[PDB]
Design a protein around this ligand. Structure first.
Ligand SMILES: Cc1cc2nc3c(=O)[nH]c(=O)nc-3n(C[C@H](O)[C@H](O)[C@H](O)COP(=O)(O)OP(=O)(O)OC[C@H]3O[C@@H](n4cnc5c(N)ncnc54)[C@H](O)[C@@H]3O)c2cc1C
Length: 502
């Protein structure tokens, strides 16, 4: 072991290797939960260094945990406990932060540390927008980390993060580390050639091939509008979005992804909708999905309790006081006039009301909605020895569900101090965080709640992935194994075996 570590320090430099528990704690603890021991955290500075570190880990038979930023919410980006059969090496990819724009910006090559934030910035002067907008973009979520988790932001027209074109390393059945270039870009024959070409930014449009594979989720547009389908719009175990790097959850080492970007959206307007009747929001969604020509850009839901705890903008304060259910509907281009006209008519009849945001209201509303997650976490710490731990569920309802707002069995409802509800309303993806009464068996509660969701036909992790909080369905387990036959990369994800060879 003294030798393996010296090799790492030789490959990335001693200032880019951490072994002291007190120093690695920063990378061993999950954003909301999850924690474990790790032998080392290494920070390669080039893709070629990443390759050599992976090779050194495979030859020392270590477990590899790829990490970018670590905003994963279900403990799947940090070690889970200490019972691994081999030492764990966390490879932080955050220094690999270059970005390569292809052509006029219609596609990009993102590297392991490229942040969504930097992607947004580089595309803006090109008149393009990224494929994803998630609550964690403001705190540095990475592009590749979202592809690995099939992340789903607030962007209603884009689907969960997805691409069939990527460059990644895979430990095969024989335990051999292999580099697989499925980027559809000619980069060379050896790892040195391929990775240097990319590290030196010597890729030009001439190296690029155009072949029909998809660099985003095609037709989510269609799937999201099908309000008569009896399955959800998107969920982590959805087999059609599990492709190589897409949904890999750390089971491969993703070096690069080729992704589609989109034309920037014209003139956006946020419509702040509030109501006390769940059915009024249900019909806004159903009518827009079935009848609008223009899909919204975003449609974020916030219940009042989560509103208060997340908590200023006076009109929002007014809406909070008047309405329990809020829908932040962002339209763009023509959808603005379409939404404004239909809402004016709809609310002359339907119970609540709405207003057209001022740039300041609109940004503060979204900033408030995001942060919902951090909220519950902080309410917990405040009331630590008085409430159990936070029970957080991530769910995707059947597209034709007529009752999205849950009415739990009275005996389950009574065990909750608070019920925090927020989500991506148009996609029927909801995050439900509960503050549970002191003395309640949280594990038993969760099990009861998961049974009710199965009964409702919902799927669960929707966007956050299974991590170590959810059991991976058969589709996922089979995918994880195909990618990592030796089970040497982020091992027990989805409550699966943590041991070598599974
Ligand atoms: C406040 C807040 C709001 C959020 N809002 C949303 C939201 O709206 N929608 C949503 O879907 N999620 C949301 N999330 C979760 C977030 O999307 C994920 O935490 C984020 O996408 C993960 O990106 P990351 O850079 O943090 O990756 P990390 O957490 O580091 O996690 C990466 C996951 O991918 C693996 N991985 C990372 N890099 C690589 C690589 N190069 N090769 C192979 N495997 C790799 C890791 O092992 C792990 O399984 C939120 C989290 C927070 C804290």
């Amino acid at each position: 072991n003294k030798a393996f570590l010296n090799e790492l320090a030789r490959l990335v430099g001693s200032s880019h290797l951490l072994t002291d528990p007190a120093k690695t704690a920063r990378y061993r603890k999950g954003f909301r939960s999850g924690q474990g021991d790790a032998l080392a955290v290494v920070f390669p500075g080039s893709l070629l260094e990443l390759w050599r570190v992976l090779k050194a880990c495979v030859t020392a038979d270590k477990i590899i945990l790829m990490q970018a930023a670590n905003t994963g919410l279900t403990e799947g980006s940090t070690p889970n406990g200490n019972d691994y059969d081999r030492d764990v090496v966390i490879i932080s990819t955050l220094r690999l932060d270059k970005l390569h724009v292809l052509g006029k910006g219609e596609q990009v090559l993102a590297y392991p540390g490229t942040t969504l934030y930097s992607l947004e910035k580089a595309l803006k002067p090109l008149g393009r927008e990224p494929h994803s907008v998630i609550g964690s973009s403001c705190i540095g979520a990475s592009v590749i980390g979202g592809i690995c988790n099939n992340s789903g932001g607030s962007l209603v027209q884009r689907g969960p993060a997805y691409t069939e074109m990527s460059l990644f390393a895979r430990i095969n059945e024989d335990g051999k580390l292999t580099l697989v270039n499925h980027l559809g870009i000619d980069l060379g024959e050896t790892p040195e050639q391929i990775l240097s070409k990319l590290d030196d930014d010597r890729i030009k449009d001439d190296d690029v091939r155009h072949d029909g594979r998809h660099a985003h989720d095609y037709d989510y547009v269609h799937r999201v509008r099908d309000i008569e389908a009896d399955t959800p719009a998107r969920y982590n175990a959805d087999p059609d979005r599990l492709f190589e790097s897409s949904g890999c959850a750390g089971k491969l080492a993703v070096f690069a992804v080729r992704l589609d970007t989109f034309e920037a959206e014209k003139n956006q307007q946020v419509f702040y909708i509030g109501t006390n009747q769940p059915e009024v929001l249900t019909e806004i969604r159903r009518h827009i999905l079935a009848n609008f020509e223009n899909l919204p850009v975003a449609g974020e839901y916030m219940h009042r309790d989560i509103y208060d705890i997340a908590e200023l903008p006076p009109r929002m304060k007014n809406w909070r006081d008047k309405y329990e259910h809020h829908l932040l509907l962002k339209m763009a281009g023509d959808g603005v006039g379409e939404a404004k006209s239909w809402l004016v008519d709809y609310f002359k009849q339907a119970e609540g009301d709405f207003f057209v945001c001022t740039p300041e209201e609109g940004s503060k509303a979204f900033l408030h909605r995001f942060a919902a997650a951090g909220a519950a976490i902080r309410y917990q710490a405040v009331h630590s020895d008085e409430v159990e731990d936070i029970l957080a569920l991530d769910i995707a309802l059947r597209r034709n569900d007529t009752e999205w707002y849950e009415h739990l069995p009275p005996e389950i409802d009574s065990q909750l101090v608070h019920k925090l509800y927020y989500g991506h309303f148009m996609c029927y993806v909801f995050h439900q965080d509960y503050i549970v009464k002191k003395g309640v068996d949280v594990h038993a509660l969760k099990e009861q709640m998961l049974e009710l969701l199965q009964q409702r036909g919902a799927q669960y992790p929707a966007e956050h992935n299974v991590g170590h909080l959810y059991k991976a369905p058969e589709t996922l387990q089979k995918f994880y194994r195909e990618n990592d036959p030796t089970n040497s990369m982020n091992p027990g994800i989805g409550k699966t075996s943590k041991r070598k060879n599974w």
